[PDB]
Amino acid sequence: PAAGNDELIGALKSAASGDGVQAIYLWGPVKSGRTHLIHAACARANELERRSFYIPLGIHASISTALLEGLEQFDLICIDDVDAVAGHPLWEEAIFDLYNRVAEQKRGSLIVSASASPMEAGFVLPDLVSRMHWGLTYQLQPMMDDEKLAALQRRAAMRGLQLPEDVGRFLLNRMARDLRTLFDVLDRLDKASMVHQRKLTIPFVKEMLRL
Amino acid sequence: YPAAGNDELIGALKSAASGDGVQAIYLWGPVKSGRTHLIHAACARANELERRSFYIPLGIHASISTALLEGLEQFDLICIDDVDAVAGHPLWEEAIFDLYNRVAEQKRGSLIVSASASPMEAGFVLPDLVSRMHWGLTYQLQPMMDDEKLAALQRRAAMRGLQLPEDVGRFLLNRMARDLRTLFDVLDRLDKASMVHQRKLTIPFVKEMLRL
């Protein structure tokens, strides 16, 4: 998503290839691009004929810490939301061991994501947080509101409809603000616009969206 | 991921949006073949090159007038989703056929339309229209063939480290939805499931998990 920055893409393309960077640490809000980038890596890994292994550690209660053993045979290991077990000494300890076992072997990489930097994610083992800083850490950028209004206007324009800056802001104060609902409501107001051959205005939008 | 992406079809679209010289394209294929996606992508490339694009979902033609077509020639790119939605309607077919001419009349811009069937297979009455559409390009978008879909499920599994027997993949395409949006979500739940029960992925295990 918003995280199409050159540096980050390189670090990932390298870890997926075992060129290569040992460990990456993505962190950001939801719909920041974490899970997508992780699978993007597993994708390039797969075409380089390097086996990868993904783990959504949000389900840590359902799985055991023994799932990290023998996991090093894989060339690329990805752990989504590793900060989900931050606080559980036993999980951090199994993850700490894994970090050292992937580095122990050659052509081993390790990409993990979280909702906060390694220090603020609230881990209990300094040893683990430090083994994490030995590698790379990137912060994925969350699309702010002003970037949304600008993208919602750029889309409207693509289909020959102008979205007055003030009308688009009225929209951001009524919709859920996520791009699925915003982009969708745009489609609705554009079909409403042609049906009534009326330009988009705040009074008109209110009438169309029952507000 | 629309398999429709083909350097020829994609090259013709890049040219239409750039004003490179393409004048009229005509897409046609099944539902979710990427018809609408290719149009948004062409209008995105147009606007990216600071060129004016205007889009019409002609599936709402019962609520709009044919006078909404006049003036659209100014736009460097005009896209009509489901142009075959007015197939059989003399007035609309005339308003469209007339637009085709007012577009190439400018020598400034092109016209991309999509459909669920080809020009000869759509059911158009006005012969002049079906003829004017042949003078452009016509591409058929193939959907994800349901064996390419196994080649796609096998890929995502190997990405997540999961092993997916070829026979289990056939059991999912067969006794579950055929679309990838849903299938991959299933592959996700069956991967988590395999990890929680630490049980290899067999047909009996999938019958249990997904309740089939």
Side-chain angles (χ1 to χ4, degrees), chain A residues 167-179:
Chain A
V167 176
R169 291 188 176 280
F170 174 86
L171 293 173
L172 282 182
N173 293 133
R174 304 297 188 188
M175 318 306 156
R177 293 179 144 205
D178 53 62
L179 288 174

Side-chain angles (χ1 to χ4, degrees), chain A:
Chain A
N5 105 58
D6 301 64
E7 271 204 17
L8 173 69
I9 298 167
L12 284 166
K13 214 194 291 183
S14 184
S17 188
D19 290 350
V21 291
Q22 276 289 159
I24 311 182
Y25 184 101
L26 315 183
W27 69 276
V30 67
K31 297 206 171 186
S32 181
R34 296 169 297 167
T35 304
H36 168 80
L37 284 175
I38 279 184
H39 276 110
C42 284
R44 181 182 180 87
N46 212 302
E47 49 181 329
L48 297 168
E49 301 195 338
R50 313 172 83 249
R51 280 164 41 175
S52 53
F53 189 92
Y54 170 80
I55 286 189
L57 201 55
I59 72 176
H60 57 99
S62 319
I63 62 177
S64 176
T65 66
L67 168 60
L68 307 185
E69 297 164 347
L71 193 58
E72 316 138 34
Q73 289 182 341
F74 288 93
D75 302 347
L76 170 70
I77 311 177
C78 302
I79 309 178
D80 220 326
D81 307 326
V82 65
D83 70 317
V85 297
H88 310 256
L90 280 188
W91 267 111
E92 295 184 19
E93 214 163 58
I95 288 176
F96 173 89
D97 290 2
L98 177 52
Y99 256 110
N100 287 334
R101 296 180 302 203
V102 169
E104 202 70 33
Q105 274 182 318
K106 298 169 184 174
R107 277 174 193 172
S109 288
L110 197 51
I111 301 175
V112 307
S113 72
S115 295
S117 51
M119 203 90 71
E120 295 296 355
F123 292 93
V124 185
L125 300 186
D127 280 358
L128 174 56
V129 171
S130 293
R131 281 301 201 281
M132 284 179 170
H133 285 320
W134 281 14
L136 290 184
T137 65
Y138 291 111
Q139 168 169 18
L140 285 63
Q141 294 306 333
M143 260 193 44
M144 46 182 169
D145 295 1
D146 282 349
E147 294 184 357
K148 298 189 177 182
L149 172 65
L152 195 50
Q153 284 177 326
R154 195 196 164 192
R155 166 148 185 153
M158 282 172 41
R159 36 199 299 178
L161 170 61
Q162 190 215 350
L163 175 51
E165 182 199 338
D166 73 320
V167 176
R169 291 188 176 280
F170 174 86
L171 293 173
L172 282 182
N173 293 133
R174 304 297 188 188
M175 318 306 156
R177 293 179 144 205
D178 53 62
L179 288 174
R180 274 174 188 168
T181 67
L182 289 173
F183 272 34
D184 184 52
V185 170
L186 185 83
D187 169 60
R188 188 177 311 163
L189 293 174
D190 183 35
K191 287 169 182 172
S193 174
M194 288 160 80
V195 157
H196 298 279
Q197 292 168 8
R198 280 194 53 193
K199 69 176 77 179
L200 279 178
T201 72
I202 293 187
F204 177 76
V205 162
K206 267 193 166 188
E207 183 189 349
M208 291 305 92
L209 301 175
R210 320 308 282 169
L211 302 177

Side-chain angles (χ1 to χ4, degrees), chain B residues 180-199:
Chain B
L180 287 184
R181 282 191 182 184
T182 308
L183 284 170
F184 291 125
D185 290 352
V186 174
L187 185 77
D188 195 55
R189 289 189 294 272
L190 292 182
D191 189 27
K192 303 183 192 178
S194 167
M195 287 186 286
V196 174
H197 305 289
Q198 288 183 314
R199 186 177 165 183

Side-chain angles (χ1 to χ4, degrees), chain B residues 22 29 37 42 65 74 79 81 84 114 117-118 121 134-135 139 161 178 183 195 201 207:
Chain B
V22 166
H37 174 76
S65 187
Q74 307 317 323
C79 302
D81 222 24
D84 63 340
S114 75
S118 58
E121 185 169 279
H134 282 309
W135 277 76
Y139 298 104
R178 289 186 179 183
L183 284 170
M195 287 186 286
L201 221 57
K207 266 193 167 186

